[PDB]
Design a protein around this ligand. Structure first.
Ligand code: HEM
Ligand code: CA
Ligand code: CA
Length: 306
């Protein structure tokens, strides 16, 4: 059983050390909080939150960093190394990389203006990485709502509230032009833009992501408050201004009878969204953790102890 007080005696200042690291980093990289939250999500959706994503290549197993959903996309690894080193100095061989990343995600959300809460702790680190599983389990922006639901159910999150709330992670952060080119110029082989994309916003996005342009160019997930963690993400959806297909489908999919009321509830109330986000975050953070004597307390998050 994971518990929020797991380190209250062994490393009482772990959350503060993690917070300090993110605060400093945010001055040079305003995108780091979003990036870290995403790392935690990518950790939990592949064999659970066991820091498997933090492992680098070895001659026996490939790193998840080369997965389609991570390669040239996931970022912030050096920052995690930094806080891990700072925590190792404060409390040697005590805090697992899995827990560190979980705390880092929560602190990132809070620092960005989101809710503040104590995440359950006690997770341990994996002894291997899972590239194939990462390629199979990470959802793609072109997924239909049924596919998005299936992807979450696959890892243990059955509730549509889990999906709608966690999708709120797109209240900040960046997205490459490559992931919306179809919506802008040729959606579903129609030669036309995605009809669920607001036409005014369509023009704006086409200007940022011209056909035959730099597909790596970055666009804000939330046009209202690009770097603030709030419920504006949902207000955008109600106006057909969700950035990627998977965002807008929560409100426009023919299968959205159950997600629409959730989108509206979160758009109508910050408290309702924040409460749901915390509940969903803890549920995701509870996915198949290694505990007790299972796995290890990695000293270097990039490699298994030797
Ligand atoms: C529901 C399915 C989801 C899909 C299909 C999806 C898709 C994407 C895509 C395409 C990107 C852009 C990557 C890039 O341009 O390199 C991205 C970024 C991001 N996602 Fe999601 N995502 C999903 C769920 C989530 C969840 C559950 C969270 C966390 C609670 C999350 C948090 C983020 C954040 C914060 C970023 C920006 C990261 C940065 O700027 O470094 N995503 N997502
Ligand atoms: Ca993992
Ligand atoms: Ca926002």
């Amino acid at each position: 059983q994971l518990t929020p007080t797991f380190y209250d005696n062994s490393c009482p200042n772990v959350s503060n050390i993690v917070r300090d690291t993110i605060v400093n980093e945010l001055r040079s990289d305003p995108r780091i909080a979003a990036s870290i939250l995403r790392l935690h999500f990518h950790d939990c959706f592949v064999n659970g939150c066991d820091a498997s994503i933090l492992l680098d290549n070895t001659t026996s197993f490939r790193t998840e960093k080369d997965a389609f959903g991570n390669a040239n996309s996931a970022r912030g690894f050096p920052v995690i190394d930094r806080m891990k080193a700072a925590v190792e100095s404060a409390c040697p061989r005590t805090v697992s990389c899995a827990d560190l990343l979980t705390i880092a995600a929560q602190q990132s959300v809070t620092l960005a203006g989101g809710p503040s809460w104590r995440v359950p702790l006690g997770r341990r680190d994996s002894l291997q990485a899972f590239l194939d599983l990462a390629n199979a389990n990470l959802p793609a922006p072109f997924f239909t709502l049924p596919q998005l639901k299936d992807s979450f159910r696959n890892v243990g999150l059955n509730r549509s509230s889990d999906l709608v709330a966690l999708s709120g992670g797109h209240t900040f952060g960046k997205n490459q032009c490559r992931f919306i080119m179809d919506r802008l110029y040729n959606f579903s082989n129609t030669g036309l833009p995605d009809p669920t994309l607001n036409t005014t916003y369509l023009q704006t996005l086409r200007g940022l992501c011209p056909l035959n342009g730099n597909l790596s160019a970055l666009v804000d997930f939330d046009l209202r408050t690009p770097t603030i963690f709030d419920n504006k993400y949902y207000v955008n959806l109600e106006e057909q201004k969700g950035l990627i297909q998977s965002d807008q489908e929560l409100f426009s999919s023919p299968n959205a009878t159950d997600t629409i009321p959730l989108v509206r509830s979160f758009a109508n109330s910050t408290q309702t969204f924040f409460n749901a986000f915390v509940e969903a975050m803890d549920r995701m953070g509870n996915i198949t953790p290694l505990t007790g004597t299972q796995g290890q307390i990695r000293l270097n998050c990039r490699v298994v102890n030797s």
